[PDB]
Every structure is written in structure tokens, then in C-alpha cells.
């Protein structure tokens, strides 16, 4: 539809090139599974689904704003739904006329927002959550008290600073939507990546106004003025370029679809040692030191919330290497 | 309809309807940003046509094998199913295809993707296995369509003042599998594309090195797929002797290192795993130009390799 | 036959006799046209091709003449009958076969006179006294150029 | 569990395949006319004066040309994915097998403590030995204990009641201690500790 269109007397040329036409179609059949692949790879962590609970208050600790409301007509939490606020951004007539189609993913949102609900509601309410065979019911404030021994400070700092941690925590949560919505930028990444591909359609679909040398753009202009020892010299202009702007299109989607292909194994990778576990690796899951993370659903990509400990206001002492008794 | 039609001369195959759009003065025809007519005007009633490709949007269909069975069910991109009786063209072309066309009770089920016909809905949830739609697959036990799981549904409830141990354990192997590298090409460019003809070979000579260009591009490939297996188990140079017993305080290993008394060099499990994967065109293609290139280290040099790994790890630390 | 049924419809896309499990997409098979939509506008006059292949004079070719038809049929199977045999019929804008199916926006007939010798200088890309003195044609020229 | 599922391998299985079809298509796009009267030279070469010839030839040295030029691309396009799948079993093979993992879901899905390699044709396999924690039972916890109005917490693992006394263990495995002054240490205010609950911490001199 896109080389020939209406054009039978095309259609009848188009067969002498071959499977040239039928290996672009199975060269974007590959990506389009792929792309399924990459999501499930990075959101379906844990094949058990947790309930997400009615108290969003764990020792303190507010998860109000990451977890969905149950009572509410959305089935995403705060920030979530700010998240694809932000992202979202005939043509579409001329797409179809030329043979150019969109497919839906295989996972909706509301399932990707369960995903994240769930890795979430078993983080807050038990460990072990990477294995998950065997789940293990631990209270918040003791899951911190563990993730505070692994990084060097020992556990009776949280117990006796609970109040003012909690409260750190729900501060910082709550700057998150804050920071979101006054920075228009900080989601560009998933902008451009609908971006590159809309423009890519769009270039696509310009390129059959081209002559290419011919004495016309138009099939059925050439094949109304000249009988086939000319027409077939003007046709094949036409066949020849519009094969190369198809093949153009199809090898920068491949090339896409490894970075992206990439950028999704890093996500998943995140997802099991920065969300499911604590991470001892510097500046992989946030900038201080890592304590625990949660995954926020996004369009055409997931959003990582990493919470860290910072030190601060310090002081110099004089020091010795060893002390000598006796 | 689909129909053929000729306006002044300016011809095409497609569908014409009713246009709402205006022209100029002088103004025969109309065109979109692909140069697609779209639409024209009457040269005797002085009104403007809509023109629309006979199909558009896509369809898909359906099948579970044709070793299975012969039922289809088709899929209607982006439409509803009260519009795919217009959208085909059921009075005009279809024959058989009417009943995939036409709605009936249970042979129509409206999804996000668009209007699957052919296929009934459960109402239940399963594992995917014929992806459709967002968040619809079918499964041949005709053809059913049903809402994908995304797992089982756990409650675990919140307390502050118990919590969990294990008391027990056991010890699991579970298995990953990694590919290392591709099966090394060449191609002669000249035999290729001209082969004996010395009339085409001093032609081809008039697109300078592109011929070359490509003979190069394949053979960097060919080096780095040495490379990569090389890199993945040459880790320790100091090859270790298989040991002769197997037996290393109760663990058995006699699955995973070679049998020195065997013809074998290989494992037990090696031997299944080589025996999974190894699934005239060959003429064709040397005839053509093309061949195949072998690997530098054979397979019982990569059985030395993990031989080595197992058997100085079993023996010893700091490996 | 691709056009029975939508497994035919797969059979015939995929190239294959035999498909596996799963879903594809597949080609339009499905509808083709029947017949066809013939418009064209309220022309019921001939095209006065008498007045200048069968003229009593024409003009020398230094002082060529140029008319305009208008509001007529150019029907060219006439001069089969009321016209002399053409020993230069050539096209150059269009295939002569297709002449019949086509309407112009605009047409104009340039005539006159020359010797056997130099009628192959009227044409494009020439030279010759006729080509660079007398009647000189574009390089892009869509036409058709008679003699007899 | 390989012998009864085919499919354990379908990753190796599928290198092999997509290049024997890359192969074959390559071939069979000789026999293509290209707009070309002929996809064979010879039978161009026999009818035909180079005048004419050469269009018809060029037209078949294009569409050849492009056939070979598509194929290198996708070999390249394969060759980096190929690679970044072979850096990635280096990696394991250094991390998992060479020594022990602390990375979540690197090594298996337990906890890591061996790994051992298997050759297979165009790739490795891995066996990963982890531990799977089972059996799992509920106690009363609690954050700390206060012994004479000071607080007293454990140096590792948790404090939990087994019904009747109070005990140290480990969150891995249950395998209950005595609490003693060596298992604690001694630190805070006891009324400064939300859910402390009081208790004798035996000291080992008595
Ligand atoms: C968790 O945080 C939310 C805010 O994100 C708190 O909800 C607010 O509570 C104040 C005080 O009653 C109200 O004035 C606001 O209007 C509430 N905001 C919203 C969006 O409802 C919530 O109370 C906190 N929960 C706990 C246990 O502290
Ligand atoms: C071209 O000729 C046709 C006749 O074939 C004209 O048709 C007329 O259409 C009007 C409506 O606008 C009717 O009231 C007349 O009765 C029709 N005429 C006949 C003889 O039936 C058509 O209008 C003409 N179009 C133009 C632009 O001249
Ligand atoms: C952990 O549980 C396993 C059972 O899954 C125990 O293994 C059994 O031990 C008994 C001896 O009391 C044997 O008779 C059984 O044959 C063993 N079963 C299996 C499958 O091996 C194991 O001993 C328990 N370990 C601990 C520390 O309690
Ligand atoms: C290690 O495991 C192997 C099996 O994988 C054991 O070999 C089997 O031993 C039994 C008992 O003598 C025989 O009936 C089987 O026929 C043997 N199988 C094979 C393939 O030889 C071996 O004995 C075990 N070694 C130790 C020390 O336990
Ligand atoms: C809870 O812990 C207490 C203290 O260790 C256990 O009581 C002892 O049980 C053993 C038998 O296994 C007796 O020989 C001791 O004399 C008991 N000591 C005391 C102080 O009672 C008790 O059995 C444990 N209960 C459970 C369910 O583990
Ligand atoms: C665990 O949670 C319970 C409540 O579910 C806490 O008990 C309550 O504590 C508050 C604050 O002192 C009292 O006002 C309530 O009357 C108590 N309720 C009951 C039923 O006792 C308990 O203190 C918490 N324990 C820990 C370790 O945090
Ligand atoms: C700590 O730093 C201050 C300068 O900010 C310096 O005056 C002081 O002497 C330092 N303390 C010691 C023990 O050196
Ligand atoms: C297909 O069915 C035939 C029987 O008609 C059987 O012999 C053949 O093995 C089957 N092939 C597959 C892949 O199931
Ligand atoms: C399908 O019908 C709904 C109204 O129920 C309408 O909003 C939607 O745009 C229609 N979709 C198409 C492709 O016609
Ligand atoms: C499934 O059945 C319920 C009735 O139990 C009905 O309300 C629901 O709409 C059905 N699902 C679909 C997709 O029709
Ligand atoms: C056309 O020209 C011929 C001379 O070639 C003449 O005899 C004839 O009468 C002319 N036709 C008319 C209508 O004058
Ligand atoms: C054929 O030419 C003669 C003039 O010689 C004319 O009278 C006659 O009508 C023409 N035949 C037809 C069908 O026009
Ligand atoms: C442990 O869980 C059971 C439910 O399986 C519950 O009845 C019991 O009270 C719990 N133990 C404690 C100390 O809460
Ligand atoms: C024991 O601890 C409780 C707080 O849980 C406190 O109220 C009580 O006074 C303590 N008993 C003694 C003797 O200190």
C-alpha cells in the first residue's frame, strides 16, 4: 500500500524485487515483540500480586503518595498521575491511506500500575520480597533498622531518631511531586523517545511526494500519459526510491530498538538489586547511601524514587592509629 | 463501492462518498502531504467527492495451527463492530468472508485493538498465549479470547509487633542460558553478483570500493565473534587435571566434569545440551559466492575451559 | 484463491500452504473493484482539426501561426477519413495511444511550411537553420508534432 | 528437566536459525528480475548489444548490490547484540562462578553461594546453586530491650519471644541464643525507645 497503493500495473513490478519487501515487514514484526518483552522484563518482578493495604501509615512512615487509593475513581498513586500528565504531549488520515499503522502493547496501564503496587505494598510490609517463596511479615521500623546496620550506622540511631526520620521521609516524598511539577524537563527522556518516533512517521509519509526523477510523484499521472516502454523507465523511478526511504525507516527502528533494548535491561536490573534488595554499589541507586527504593509506573518507561542517607554538619577530632596500654 | 473511476482523465481505484471540504474557483482536484488525491470535483454536478483506499487500518488474523485446526478468527484494527460492515465491503466483494463481516449473537467482542470477530470470550483469566490486544489473548481450547493474569493475588497482613523466621531450607539449582557468538559469514562480492560474466565484473569495477567495503565490514565481524567466546571462558589460564574423584565431602559432581574413562570429553549434561541445539541450499550458496568460516577453538577446547573452572574451584579458593 | 476466505487470505501472504500458531497480519485480497466511474464534462463539439489540415494557405515558416481550439472533442480518429496521410507523427509530452483519454487545460496548434530536409529539425534539443532561426522548441516540450 | 523441555535452549536455537534464513534469503534474491527482462546476465548478454544491454545489467548490478548491502547491515545490527550478550556472560562467569555474588537476581533467585559453567554450541550455560529459606514461623518481637532502665539492643539479628521466654536469632534461620550481655549492647535511655519491653540480660560473670 505504501510503494504501489492503487496502482496494479506497480504491483505487477513490485513482485520482480523479490522478498525485499517481505523482510522489511519482518524486520519491524521483531521489534514490535520486543517491545512487549521489555516491559514485562521490567514491571513483572513478582509474579504474586499484593493487596494494597487500607493504612498507608507504617510506623510514621507516609506511603500515601506512591500507593493508589482504593477509594478513589484512579487506580495510579499521586505521583504516578502526574507522572503521565507530563509525558503525554489528518496526519494520522495520511499514515493509514499510505499503509503506515500504530499497535497497542500487550500490557495496559492499569496493569503496569499494578505491577508497581504490588512490588510496593510487599516491600512495606515484608522482606524477602526477591525470592517471595516464602515471603517473610517483618514491621517498617525494623526493615529500616536492618537497612541503617547496612550502611555502617548502627541500629539504636533509628529507633531513638524514628519521629524525626519519618518525618524526613515524608517531607522528602512529598517535594517529589513538587519538584515534578515545576520541572517540565525532568521527564524529557521519556518525551523524547515519543518525539523520535512521531517525526520518523511523519518523514515517512513526506517522502511519497517525491519525483525521485520522475517526471511525476503519482503512479496513476505516469500510467495515464505513457504506455509501458516509457512508463515502466518513470515507474521504477519511483519504485527504486520509495524502497529506499522504506529501508531507511526500518534499519534507524533497529538501531532505536537497541538502545532502547539496553535502556530496559538497566531498568530491570535496577528494579531487582535497588527496589527488591539494597544496593552496596556507589552511585547506582542514588547519590548518598543507599537505602531503600520504589518504582513509579510512566509512559514508555518506569520512574525509580531512591531513598538515601546523607551525612551531614561534621566535625574534626584529633585522631591516633593505635592506642598503647602497657 | 470499490470501484475504478476516470474524472478529466485523472484516474484511480477507490471509494467515493459525499466531500465537506471546499474548493477554489479553478480548482479540479485535491491532494495531501503524500500527494494522495483525496478529492475531486464532478465535471458535471458541480460537487465535491471524498476519495478512501478501498482498505485501510489493518487486519489481522488469528489462527491456532493449521495442524490443529481450521479456525480463524480476524481481528479489525482501530474499529468498532458496528462499523466493520462498511468498513469491509460485504455487498460488494465478500463471499465466505460475510460471516466474519456481519455481527451474529457471540460472534462479536469489542476490545481496545479493535472488533474481534469468529472467537468467543470466556470471562475468566489465564496465561497469555496468543497475544490479540492490550490485555487480551486467546487460547484454541474454535478460538477463546480472555483477559491475560498477571499473577495470583496475596494479602499479607500489616502487624508491628511479630514477625517471620525461617526454620528450615533447601538447597536449589535453577539454569540460565547466554548466547556468545554468531556463526562466521563470507561473501565474494564479484562471484556474488556477477559471477561469470566478465561483461558485468567491469561494470561492477565502476562502483568503486563499495564491492570492498563490504567484504570488510563481515570480516570484522568474524574476528569478534572469536572474541566474544574467548572472552567469556578463557577466564583462568592454568588448566586444572580432572580430578578422578567426584566425591567432595557428600557432593556429588560426576554430572557436571568429563568421565576420563569415557570416549567423551564432555559431561553428562554437556552431551544433552549439545544434542537440544543442533536442529542443496548448501550448493546454492557456495555456487553464489557464500560460505561458512569455522570458529578458532573447537568444542573440546571449551570443555577444557569449563573443565578447568569446575575442577579448580571443587580443589580450591582465590580461583 | 487468495480472495475465499480469511485463511486463504493468510495462506496466500504468508507464501505458505501450511501457518503456524499465532497472529498475523495480512494483505487485502479481500475487495476489488467491478466497474468503473466514467466522468467527463459537457463537450458535444468536434475540434476544428479542418481549418488547419485541410486550409487553403499556409504561412512561410519565418512567419509561423499560432491558433488556439477551445470547447471541443479531440477526437484524432477523424483525419483517418478527412486527411491526408501523416508521414511524421510524433509525441513527445504524451504516448499517441493515450490521446483520447485525456483532457487538456490548455492546447495550442503552431503551423507553416518547410522542405522534406527539415522537418526533422522540428524538435527539441535541435540545430539547423529552421532550429535556431525560424521555430525553436523547449527542452521540455509536451506536445506532438505532425507533418505530411 | 532439559530432556523434557526442548525450549530450555530456545535461545540458542534461535541464533542458529535466524542465520541459516539470513543465508537462504541472501540466495534466493538472484533469481529476481529487478525491472530487469532477465535475472540472468548471460541470457541479457546473448539477446542484447551493450546500447541496450547495459541498462538492462545495471538494473540487475543495483537491486544485487542492495540485497548484499541489506544483509552486512543486519549482520552488524546482530553482531552488537550478540556482543553485549557475551560481555554479560563474562561478567558472570567472573562474579558467579569465580567467586560469590551480593547482587539481587544476578545468580539465580536465592541466595548465591556457588555457580558452575556448561559448554553448549554459540553459548554458555550456567547451573546457579542458591539457598531458599522455608518453613517460616510468627513471633512477638521487639525493637529493644530495657534491663535496669537502660536499653539494650542486639549486635545482629532480631529479638523474638518463642511464647514464654525471649531469645536472639537470626532473620536467615531460625536458631535461638540466650541474651547475654555479649549479644547486646547497651545504649540509650529505655523511655526514648517506642516499644521496648523489659527483660533480664544475663551477664555471663554471675
Ligand atoms: C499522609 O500525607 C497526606 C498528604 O500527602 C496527608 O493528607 C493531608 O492531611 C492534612 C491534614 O489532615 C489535610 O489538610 C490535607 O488536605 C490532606 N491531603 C490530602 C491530599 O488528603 C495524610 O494525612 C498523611 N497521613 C498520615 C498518617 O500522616
Ligand atoms: C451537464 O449535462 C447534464 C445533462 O446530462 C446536466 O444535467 C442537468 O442537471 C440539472 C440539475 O442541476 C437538471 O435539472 C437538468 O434537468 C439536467 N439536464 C438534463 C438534460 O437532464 C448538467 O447540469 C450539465 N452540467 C453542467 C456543468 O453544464
Ligand atoms: C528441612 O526440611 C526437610 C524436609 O523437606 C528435612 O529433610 C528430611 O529429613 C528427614 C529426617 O528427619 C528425612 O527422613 C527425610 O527423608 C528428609 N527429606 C528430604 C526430602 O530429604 C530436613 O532435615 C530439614 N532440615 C532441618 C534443619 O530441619
Ligand atoms: C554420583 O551420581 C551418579 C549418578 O549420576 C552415581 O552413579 C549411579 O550409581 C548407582 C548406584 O550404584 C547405579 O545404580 C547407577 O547406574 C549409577 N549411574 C551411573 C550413570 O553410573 C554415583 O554413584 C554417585 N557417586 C557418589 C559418590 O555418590
Ligand atoms: C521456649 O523456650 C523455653 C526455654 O528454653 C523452653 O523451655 C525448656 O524446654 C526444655 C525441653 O525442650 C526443658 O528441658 C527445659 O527445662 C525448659 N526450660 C524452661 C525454663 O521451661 C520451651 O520448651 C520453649 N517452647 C517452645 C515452643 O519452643
Ligand atoms: C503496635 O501497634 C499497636 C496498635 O495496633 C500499639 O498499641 C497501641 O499503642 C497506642 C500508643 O501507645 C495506644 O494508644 C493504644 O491504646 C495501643 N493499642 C493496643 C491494643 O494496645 C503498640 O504499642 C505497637 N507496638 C510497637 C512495638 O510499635
Ligand atoms: C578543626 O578545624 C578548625 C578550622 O575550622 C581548626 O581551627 C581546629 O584547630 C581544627 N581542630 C583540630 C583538632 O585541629
Ligand atoms: C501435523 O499433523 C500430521 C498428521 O496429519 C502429523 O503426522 C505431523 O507430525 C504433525 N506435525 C506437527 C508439527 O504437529
Ligand atoms: C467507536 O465508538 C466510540 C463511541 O462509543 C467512539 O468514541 C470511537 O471514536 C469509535 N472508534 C472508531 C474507530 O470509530
Ligand atoms: C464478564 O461477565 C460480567 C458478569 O459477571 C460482565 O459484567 C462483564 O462485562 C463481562 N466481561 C466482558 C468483557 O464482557
Ligand atoms: C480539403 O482539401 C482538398 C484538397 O486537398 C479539397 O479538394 C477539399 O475540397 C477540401 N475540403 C473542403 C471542405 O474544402
Ligand atoms: C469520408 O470522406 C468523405 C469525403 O471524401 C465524406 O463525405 C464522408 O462523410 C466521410 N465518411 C465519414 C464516415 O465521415
Ligand atoms: C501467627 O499467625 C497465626 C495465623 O496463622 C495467628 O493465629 C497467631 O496468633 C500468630 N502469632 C502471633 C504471635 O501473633
Ligand atoms: C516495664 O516497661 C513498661 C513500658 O513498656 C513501663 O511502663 C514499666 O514501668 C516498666 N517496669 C519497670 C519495673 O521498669
Not at chain 2, 463481516?101 to 470470550?121: E, I, K
Not at chain 4, 535496669?148 to 521466654?165: C, I, L, S
Amino acid at each position: 500500500m505504501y510503494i504501489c497503493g492503487d496502482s496494479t500495473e506497480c504491483s505487477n513490478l513490485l513482485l520482480q524485487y523479490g522478498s525485499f519487501c517481505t523482510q522489511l515487514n519482518r524486520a519491524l514484526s521483531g521489534i514490535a515483540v520486543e517491545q512487549d518483552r521489555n516491559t514485562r522484563d521490567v514491571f513483572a518482578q513478582t509474579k504474586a500480586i499484593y493487596k494494597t493495604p487500607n493504612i498507608k501509615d507504617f510506623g510514621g512512615f507516609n506511603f500515601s503518595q506512591i500507593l493508589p487509593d482504593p477509594k478513589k475513581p484512579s487506580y495510579r498513586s499521586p505521583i504516578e498521575d502526574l507522572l503521565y500528565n507530563k509525558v503525554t504531549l489528518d496526519l494520522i488520515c495520511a499514515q493509514k491511506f499510505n499503509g503506515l499503522t500504530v499497535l497497542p502493547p500487550l500490557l495496559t496501564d492499569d496493569m503496569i500500575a499494578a505491577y508497581t503496587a504490588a512490588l510496593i505494598s510487599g516491600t512495606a510490609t515484608a522482606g524477602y520480597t526477591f525470592g517471595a517463596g516464602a515471603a517473610l511479615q517483618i514491621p517498617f521500623p525494623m526493615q529500616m533498622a536492618y537497612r541503617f546496620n547496612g550502611i555502617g550506622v548502627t541500629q539504636n540511631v533509628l529507633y531513638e531518631n524514628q519521629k524525626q526520620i519519618a518525618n524526613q521521609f515524608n517531607n522528602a516524598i512529598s517535594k517529589i511531586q513538587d519538584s515534578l511539577t515545576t520541572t517540565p524537563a525532568a521527564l524529557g527522556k521519556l518525551q523524547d523517545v515519543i518525539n523520535q518516533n512521531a517525526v520518523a512517521l511523519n518523514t515517512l509519509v513526506k517522502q511519497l511526494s517525491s519525483n525521485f526523477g520522475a517526471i511525476s510523484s503519482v503512479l496513476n499521472d505516469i500510467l495515464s500519459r505513457l504506455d509501458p516502454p516509457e512508463a515502466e523507465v518513470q515507474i521504477d523511478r519511483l519504485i527504486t526510491g520509495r524502497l529506499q526511504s522504506l529501508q531507511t525507516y526500518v534499519t534507524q527502528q533497529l538501531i532505536r530498538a537497541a538502545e532502547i533494548r539496553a535502556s530496559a535491561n538497566l531498568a530491570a536490573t535496577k528494579m531487582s538489586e535497588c527496589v527488591l534488595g539494597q544496593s552496596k554499589r556507589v552511585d547506582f541507586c542514588g547519590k548518598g547511601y543507599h537505602l531503600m527504593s520504589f518504582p513509579q509506573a510512566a509512559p514508555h518507561g518506569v520512574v525509580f524514587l531512591h531513598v538515601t542517607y546523607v551525612p551531614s554538619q561534621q566535625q574534626n577530632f584529633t585522631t591516633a592509629p593505635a592506642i598503647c596500654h602497657n | 463501492k470499490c470501484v475504478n473511476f476516470n474524472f478529466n482523465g485523472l484516474t484511480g481505484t477507490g471509494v467515493l462518498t459525499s466531500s465537506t471540504k471546499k474548493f477554489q474557483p479553478f480548482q479540479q482536484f485535491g491532494r495531501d502531504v503524500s500527494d494522495f488525491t483525496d478529492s475531486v470535483r464532478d465535471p458535471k454536478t458541480l460537487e465535491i467527492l471524498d476519495i478512501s483506499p478501498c482498505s485501510y487500518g489493518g487486519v489481522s488474523v488469528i489462527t491456532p495451527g493449521t495442524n490443529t485446526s481450521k479456525a480463524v478468527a480476524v481481528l479489525y484494527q482501530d474499529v468498532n463492530c458496528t462499523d466493520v460492515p462498511t468498513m469491509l465491503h460485504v455487498e460488494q466483494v465478500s463471499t465466505d468472508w460475510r460471516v466474519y463481516a456481519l455481527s451474529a449473537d457471540g460472534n462479536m467482542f469489542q476490545t481496545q485493538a479493535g472488533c474481534l470477530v469468529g472467537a468467543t470470550y470466556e470471562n475468566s483469566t489465564y496465561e497469555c498465549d496468543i497475544p490479540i490486544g492490550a490485555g487480551i489473548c486467546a487460547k484454541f481450547g474454535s478460538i477463546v479470547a480472555y483477559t491475560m493474569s498477571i499473577g495470583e493475588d496475596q494479602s499479607i497482613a500489616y502487624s508491628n509487633n511479630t514477625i517471620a523466621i525461617p526454620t528450615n531450607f533447601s538447597i536449589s539449582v535453577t539454569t540460565e542460558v547466554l548466547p556468545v557468538s554468531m556463526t562466521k559469514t563470507s561473501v565474494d562480492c564479484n562471484m556474488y553478483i556477477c559471477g561469470d560474466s566478465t561483461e558485468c565484473s567491469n561494470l561492477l569495477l565502476q562502483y568503486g570500493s563499495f564491492c570492498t567495503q563490504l567484504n570488510r565490514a563481515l570480516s570484522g565481524i568474524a574476528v569478534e565473534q572469536d572474541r566474544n567466546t574467548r572472552d567469556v571462558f578463557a577466564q583462568t589460564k592454568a588448566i586444572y587435571k580432572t580430578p578422578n574423584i567426584k566425591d567432595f565431602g557428600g557432593f556429588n559432581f560426576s554430572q557436571i566434569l568429563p568421565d576420563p574413562k569415557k570416549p567423551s570429553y564432555r559431561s553428562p549434561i554437556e552431551d544433552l545440551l549439545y544434542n537440544k541445539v543442533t536442529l542443496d541450499l548448501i550448493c546454492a550458496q557456495k555456487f553464489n559466492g557464500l560460505t561458512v568460516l569455522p570458529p578458532l577453538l573447537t568444542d573440546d577446547m571449551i570443555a577444557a575451559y569449563t573443565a578447568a573452572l569446575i575442577s579448580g574451584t571443587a580443589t580450591a579458593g582465590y580461583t | 484463491d487468495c480472495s475465499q476466505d480469511p485463511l486463504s487470505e493468510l495462506k496466500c501472504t504468508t507464501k505458505s500452504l501450511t501457518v503456524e500458531k499465532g497472529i498475523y497480519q495480512t494483505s487485502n485480497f479481500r475487495v476489488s473493484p467491478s466497474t468503473e466511474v466514467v466522468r467527463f464534462p459537457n463537450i458535444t463539439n468536434l475540434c476544428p482539426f479542418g481549418q488547419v489540415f485541410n486550409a487553403s494557405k499556409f504561412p512561410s515558416v519565418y512567419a509561423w501561426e499560432r491558433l488556439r481550439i477551445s470547447d471541443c472533442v479531440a477526437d484524432y480518429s477523424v483525419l483517418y477519413n478527412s486527411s491526408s496521410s501523416f508521414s511524421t507523427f510524433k509525441c513527445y509530452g504524451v504516448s499517441p495511444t493515450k490521446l483520447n483519454d485525456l483532457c487538456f487545460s490548455s492546447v495550442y496548434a503552431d503551423y507553416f511550411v518547410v522542405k522534406g530536409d527539415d522537418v526533422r529539425q522540428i524538435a527539441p534539443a535541435q540545430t539547423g537553420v529552421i532550429a535556431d532561426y525560424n521555430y525553436k522548441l523547449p527542452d521540455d516540450f509536451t506536445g506532438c508534432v505532425l507533418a505530411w | 528437566s532439559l530432556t523434557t523441555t526442548p525450549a530450555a535452549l530456545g535461545k540458542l536455537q534461535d541464533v542458529i536459525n535466524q542465520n541459516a534464513v539470513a543465508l537462504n534469503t541472501l540466495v534466493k534474491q538472484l533469481s529476481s528480475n529487478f525491472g530487469a527482462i532477465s535475472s540472468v546476465l548471460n541470457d541479457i548478454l546473448s539477446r542484447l548489444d551493450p546500447p541496450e544491454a547495459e541498462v538492462q545489467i545495471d538494473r540487475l548490478i543495483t537491486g544485487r548490490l542492495q540485497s548484499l548491502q541489506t544483509y552486512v547491515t543486519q549482520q552488524l545490527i546482530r553482531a552488537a547484540e550478540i556482543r553485549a550478550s557475551a560481555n554479560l556472560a563474562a561478567t558472570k562467569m567472573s562474579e558467579c562462578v569465580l567467586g560469590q555474588s551480593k547482587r539481587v537476581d544476578f545468580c539465580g533467585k536465592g541466595y548465591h553461594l556457588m555457580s558452575f559453567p556448561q559448554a553448549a554450541p554459540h553459548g554458555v550455560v550456567f547451573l546457579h546453586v542458591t539457598y531458599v529459606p522455608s518453613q517460616q514461623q510468627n513471633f512477638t518481637t521487639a525493637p529493644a530491650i530495657c534491663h535496669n532502665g537502660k536499653a539494650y539492643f542486639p549486635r545482629e539479628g532480631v529479638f523474638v519471644m518463642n511464647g514464654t521466654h525471649w531469645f536472639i536469632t537470626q532473620r536467615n534461620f531460625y536458631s535461638p541464643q540466650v541474651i547475654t550481655t555479649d549479644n547486646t549492647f547497651e545504649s540509650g535511655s529505655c523511655d526514648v525507645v517506642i516499644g521496648i519491653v523489659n527483660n533480664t540480660v544475663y551477664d555471663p560473670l554471675q
